[PDB]
Ligand binder design. Structure first.
Ligand SMILES: Nc1nc2c(ncn2[C@@H]2O[C@H](COP(=O)(O)OP(=O)(O)OP(=O)(O)O)[C@@H](O)[C@H]2O)c(=O)[nH]1
Length: 332
């Protein structure tokens, strides 16, 4: 009906449709925490090639791709199987995000499924006009040369189908956290992924002390190119003043940012989070990027955050200072 159709539309246009998609054991592992812990204003879809894994995964919608190829046992770190498996189910996937204004594709680069599928999804995402964003991590050195090699090649493909590509050099984590088994190191990674994907999405969908227009988010990330996360947090007197400079100095931000084209700041904190602090954070990051960089900044209150202010930094437009290498990212 015409009268209804018009009401319907008003509804849908009231807010944006965000969809977070995680591929592979890594991606699925992230999708579950977001789902359980809850992710404001975002739909969660988890696609894997391993049925057993997809089973113990929590999400709004699950999808088993590449039925033929993989007997539901995984692509065995073979990217090609992932890419093929995806396209097979390129349809049931397109329906999973069919009406999204923005779609996030997250996973852990280096394996088969993730490295493979991640880009296929990115392409499907874009064909439907959705603002496309990926948030993937690079493999640990302990993982070997072959793993990294594939990761990088996947990271390449991904770049050709994304509006703003965010990568985390899992390796740099040891420059923060101490030495530890490849098992526990993964946990550290697990955290960071959640903080980045959640922190991003929620910078758009959660109500904070500052208005964050989707029109601006869309503008700044429509050409994000390559972007790098940066995390920090303080407890002291000048927590605001610290968390910022701590995130700005996070080894995860492996690149020079003097010529930052854009940035997405999401300052989080306790009930006593003030606009000055938020202001403080933004002011700092602002004087580091291009004097004319487009900056999107929010400031919410975290349910459980006694007296700690966490800060998420996602510097976009840094592809001009990084060089893809079969062994990883080099600071060109
Ligand atoms: N944070 C996190 N990283 C992990 C974990 N397990 C694997 N990864 C990372 O993600 C990369 C690939 O993800 P996998 O979990 O192997 O998933 P997949 O590649 O989709 O699976 P296959 O194609 O069958 O090999 C690995 O090289 C690791 O970097 C985990 O549980 N947590």
């Amino acid at each position: 009906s015409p009268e209804d159709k018009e009401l319907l539309e008003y509804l849908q246009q009231t807010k944006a449709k965000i969809t977070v998609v995680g591929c592979g054991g890594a991606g699925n592992n992230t999708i579950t925490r977001l789902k359980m812990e809850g992710i404001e204003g975002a739909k969660t879809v988890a696609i894997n090639t391993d049925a057993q894994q997809l089973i113990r995964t929590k999400a709004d919608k699950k999808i088993l791709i590449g039925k033929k190829l993989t007997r539901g046992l995984g692509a065995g770190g073979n990217p090609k199987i992932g890419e093929e498996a995806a396209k097979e189910s390129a349809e049931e996937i397109k329906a999973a995000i069919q009406d999204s204004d923005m779609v996030f594709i997250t996973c852990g680069l280096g394996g088969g499924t993730g490295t493979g599928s991640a880009p296929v999804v990115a392409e499907i995402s874009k064909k439907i006009g959705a603002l496309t964003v990926a948030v993937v991590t690079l493999p640990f050195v302990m993982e070997g040369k072959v793993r990294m090699k594939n990761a990088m090649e996947g990271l390449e493909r991904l770049k050709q189908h994304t509006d703003t590509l965010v990568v985390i050099p899992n390796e740099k984590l040891f420059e923060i956290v101490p030495n530890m088994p490849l098992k526990l190191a993964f946990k550290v990674a697990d955290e960071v992924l959640i903080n980045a994907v959640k922190g991003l999405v929620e910078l758009i969908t959660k109500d904070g002390l500052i208005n964050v227009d989707f029109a601006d988010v869309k503008a700044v990330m429509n050409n994000g190119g390559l972007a790098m996360i940066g995390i920090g947090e303080s407890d002291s007197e000048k927590r605001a003043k610290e968390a910022v400079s701590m995130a700005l100095n996070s080894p995860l931000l492996d690149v020079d940012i003097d010529g930052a084209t854009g940035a997405l700041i999401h300052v989080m904190g306790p009930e006593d989070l003030t606009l000055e602090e938020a202001r403080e954070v933004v002011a700092t990051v602002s004087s580091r990027l291009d004097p004319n960089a487009t900056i999107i900044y929010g400031a919410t209150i975290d349910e459980n955050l006694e007296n700690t202010v966490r800060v998420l930094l996602v510097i976009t437009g840094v592809q001009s200072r990084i060089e893809f290498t079969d062994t990883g990212l080099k600071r060109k």
